[PDB]
């Protein structure tokens, strides 16, 4: 699997 | 019982050879001291529990005596043992110098060939080599952090160093810049705290994760913004929620707090993940 | 030979004191380990070799022991030597920490007080100081470019840094932000290529003149539009003719080409003026 980074919320 | 100390003469003997001849002539009597030529050495059919002094550790003669099982040491071993009034080592294997005497090492997280090389050059420099980690080990040689042996050595507060330490010790010894393994500085060869770690974070604010990224890279590890399986070793996470956390849990990846990371920096090695789980 | 270790207790000892107290017990037995109050320290009156631990390096006790010539080191030297398995320095003078251990410096182009101050804080941070520039020198500290020592150090490709570096090393150390001199970035403290130069030009077109002024200011130097007596250190001039050239000569100002300027920028230090004469 691959999970992207939590974007600059 | 008495045992002869034979010096192998050749066309181009080194300065070390003659230096050892003069020191052994000055601190022991010449009664058990011979100088043998290459002819007489080649003709020796059997190991006669005598001590041979070769320089270098190569050539038809050295190969001959090594094959017979002879007790061979380099002249630098003679100079050393004479100067410090200490015994010549056992020498189950040939020993070229004593730069690494009193050093006992074990290895972990190394390629087989690299480990064999470390074993060879440590043995040639008068050190001892143990497969498993026992109390007499003075330094651990490691290619990555994390392993069970790594942790054991860390709990014993033993230096964990890179193969480069051995390489430098050897090279610097052949350049006649060092007599002893303490002459070079250990901290330039420490294993980095996160060498081999691939660290991801979740739930941290941007300043926190930039700090973690910076420190990770500084301490030899790799930082990843995105979580990639078959890559990430540690997911830093204070609160157990989110897609990153649950994905890491389904893949049995280390899920640790920030205290694992900063404690690892503070205490100087990669801490045990099991105490910092969430 | 004996190796006593006494610990000075006081009203306000730092956390370093207790950390060193707990760390020092894990090597040797408490046979040579003492805790002394200010009274018992005050009552001693002769140097008995031994190792004293003061924190801070001030007070009636510190003044007493220092003025007697005692061997004093700070607790951070204990923490460092323990952690890195290296020896405690000899220290004819008191040494407060090991942040600058393995650093050897010399100074040039400094005010007397500034040089003495740099000597003080470097010695206190575990570094060594040489009056003359020797191969073992690792960093040169300079207030201006130009001196013979500056050129020698530059030709050996040694770092030439500003006294502020020492100050940062000191301050960042007291704030417990750094353990080692490598934690701060050396490039941020380089000595500017033209620091101390006051540069004039003549014979250049306006675009060239403007470029030289811009770069001079950028690289730490001062620019002057008009050649003045004494004020100007270098007159850039390609051909030895004109009133500017002759006046610069009979004021003993360096008359160099533009190649001096741009070479100095390219190669990262103020070049030898004698090679660029006109």
Author numbering:
A (entry chain C): 665 to 673
B (entry chain B), C (entry chain A): 7 to 284
Quoted passage from the original study:
53BP1 and TOPBP1 are multi-domain scaffold proteins that individually contribute to the genome stability functions of mammalian cells. Amongst other roles, TOPBP1 is involved in replication initiation through its interaction with TICCR/Treslin; the DNA damage checkpoint through interactions with 9-1-1, RHNO1/RHINO and ATR; and sister chromatid de-catenation and suppression of sister chromatid exchange via interactions with TOP2A and BLM. 53BP1 is recruited to sites of DNA damage through interaction with post-translationally modified histones and is strongly implicated in the process of choice between the non-homologous end joining and homologous recombination pathways of double-strand break (DSB) repair, as well as the localisation of activated ATM that is required for DSB repair in heterochromatin. Using a structurally-derived consensus pattern for phospho-ligand binding to the N-terminal regions of TOPBP1 and Rad4, we have now identified conserved phosphorylation sites in human 53BP1, and have biochemically and structurally characterised their interaction with BRCT domains of TOPBP1.
Of the four peptides, only the one centred on 53BP1-pThr670 bound tightly to TOPBP1-BRCT0,1,2 (Kd = 1.5 ± 0.2 μM). Treatment with λ-phosphatase eliminated binding, confirming that phosphorylation of the 53BP1 sequence is required. A high affinity interaction (Kd = 1.0 ± 0.2 μM) was still observed with TOPBP1-BRCT0,1,2-K155E, in which the phospho-binding site in the BRCT1 domain is mutationally disabled, but binding was ~10 fold weaker (Kd = 13.5 ± 6.2 μM) with TOPBP1-BRCT0,1,2-K250E, in which BRCT2 is mutated. These data implicate BRCT2 as the primary binding site, consistent with the presence of a hydrophilic residue −4 to the phosphothreonine, but with BRCT1 potentially providing a weaker alternative site. Co-crystallisation of TOPBP1-BRCT0,1,2 with the 53BP1-pThr670 phospho-peptide produced a crystal structure with peptide bound to BRCT2, consistent with the specificity it displays for that site in binding assays. The position and overall conformation of the bound peptide is similar to that previously described for the interaction of Crb2-derived phospho-peptides pThr187 and pThr235 bound to BRCT2 of Rad4. The phosphorylated side chain of 53BP1-Thr670 interacts with TOPBP1-Thr208 and TOPBP1-Lys250, which are topologically conserved in all BRCT domains capable of phospho-specific peptide interaction. The phosphate also interacts with the head group of TOPBP1-Arg215 which makes an additional hydrogen bond interaction with the side chain of 53BP1-Glu669. The side chain of the −3 residue of the phospho-peptide motif (see above), 53BP1-Ile667, packs into a hydrophobic pocket formed between the side chains of TOPBP1 residues Leu233, Gln249, Lys250 and Cys253. Additional specificity is provided by polar interactions between 53BP1-Glu669 and TOPBP1-Arg215, 53BP1-Glu666 and TOPBP1-Lys234, and 53BP1-Glu665 and the side chains of Arg256 and Trp257 of TOPBP1.
